[PDB]
Design a protein around this ligand. Structure first.
Ligand SMILES: NS(=O)(=O)c1ccc(C(=O)N2CCN(Cc3ccc(F)cc3)CC2)cc1
Ligand SMILES: [Zn+2]
Length: 257
C-alpha cells in the first residue's frame, strides 16, 4: 500500500487501489441534525469497559493505535442499534493541523478538532479479519474532540507519544482505562458505513456520540508532533489524517434521542 493523506496519495486518490471508495455506504458522512430521525426502537447503548486490558500503543504511519487484549469478552459494546456482542480491539484518533479541522464525521458541516474511534468486532465472526468481511462485522464508537479544558483521562496517552514518534514504533501501554475518554452522555447518531481508511470495507455500524469531549490545546498540540515517516526519514508531521465526508446516498441516520 502507498496510500496516505498527502497531496499525491490522499483520499481523492484512494479509489484507484480501492474502488469501493466510491461505494454505496462509505464513511465518514456529514450528520445533518435536522434530517436525522429519532428512532424510539433503539435500545440504550451498553459500554462495558471495566475489565478492559490495554496492551500496547503503536504508531502505524497513519495514526496511533492503543491496542487491547480481545482474546476474551472483556471490554464490550452492545445494545443501541447492535445485535450481539462487539469486542474492543483498539482505539485511535484522526486530527487536524489546526483546531478548525480534524474530525471525519461532521455535524451540520461543523468540523471538530479531532475524532476518537473505539473499534469493536462482532464476536459471532470469531476474529477481526473475518469480521471486516461482513456487513455487520464492526461497530465503531466515534467521539468528537473540541479544544478547551484538558481531558484528564487522555494525559497518559499524550505522555507516551514521545516514545512512538515515528512509523513502526510501539510502546508498552498496559492498564489504560478507556472509560476516561467518554463524555457524560451516551446519546448518539447511528448509520451503516465503512472503515474510513483503506481497505474502506463496508462493514461498520457507526455509533457517533452527540456530546464531544474537551481536550486542551497542549494535549492536541502533542498529537501534531507525531510523524507519518519512519525514523531517519524527512520529517512529515502527522496532521490532517482524516478522510472528508462522503455521499450519504441511500442511507438514513437515526438518533437515539
Ligand atoms: N478509521 S476506522 O474506520 O475506525 C478503522 C477501524 C479499524 C481499522 C483497522 O484496525 N485496520 C484496517 C486497516 N488494516 C490495514 C489494511 C490497509 C489496507 C488494506 F488494503 C488492507 C489492510 C489494518 C486494520 C482501520 C480503520
Ligand atoms: Zn478511525
Amino acid at each position: 500500500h502507498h496510500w496516505g493523506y498527502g497531496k499525491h496519495n490522499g483520499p481523492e486518490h484512494w479509489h484507484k487501489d480501492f474502488p469501493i471508495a466510491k461505494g454505496e455506504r462509505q464513511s465518514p458522512v456529514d450528520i445533518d441534525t435536522h434530517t436525522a430521525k429519532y428512532d424510539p426502537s433503539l435500545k440504550p447503548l451498553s459500554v462495558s469497559y471495566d475489565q478492559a486490558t490495554s496492551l500496547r500503543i503503536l504508531n502505524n504511519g497513519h495514526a496511533f493505535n492503543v491496542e487491547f487484549d480481545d482474546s476474551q469478552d472483556k471490554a464490550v459494546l452492545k445494545g443501541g442499534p447492535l445485535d450481539g456482542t462487539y469486542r474492543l480491539i483498539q482505539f485511535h484518533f484522526h486530527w487536524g493541523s489546526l483546531d478548525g479541522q480534524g474530525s471525519e464525521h461532521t455535524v451540520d458541516k461543523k468540523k471538530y478538532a479531532a475524532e476518537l474511534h473505539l473499534v469493536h468486532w462482532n464476536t459471532k465472526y470469531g476474529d477481526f479479519g473475518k469480521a471486516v468481511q461482513q456487513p455487520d462485522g464492526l461497530a465503531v464508537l466515534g467521539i468528537f474532540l473540541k479544544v478547551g479544558s484538558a481531558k484528564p483521562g487522555l494525559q497518559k496517552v499524550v505522555d507516551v507519544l514521545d516514545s512512538i514518534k515515528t512509523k513502526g514504533k510501539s510502546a508498552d501501554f498496559t492498564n489504560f482505562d478507556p472509560r476516561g475518554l467518554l463524555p457524560e452522555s451516551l446519546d448518539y447518531w447511528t448509520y451503516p458505513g465503512s472503515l474510513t481508511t483503506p481497505p474502506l470495507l463496508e462493514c461498520v455500524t457507526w455509533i457517533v456520540l452527540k456530546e464531544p469531549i474537551s481536550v486542551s490545546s497542549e494535549q492536541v498540540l502533542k498529537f501534531r508532533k507525531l510523524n507519518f515517516n519512519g525514523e531517519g526519514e524527512p520529517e512529515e508531521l502527522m496532521v490532517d489524517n482524516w478522510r472528508p465526508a462522503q455521499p450519504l446516498k441511500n442511507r438514513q441516520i437515526k438518533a437515539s434521542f
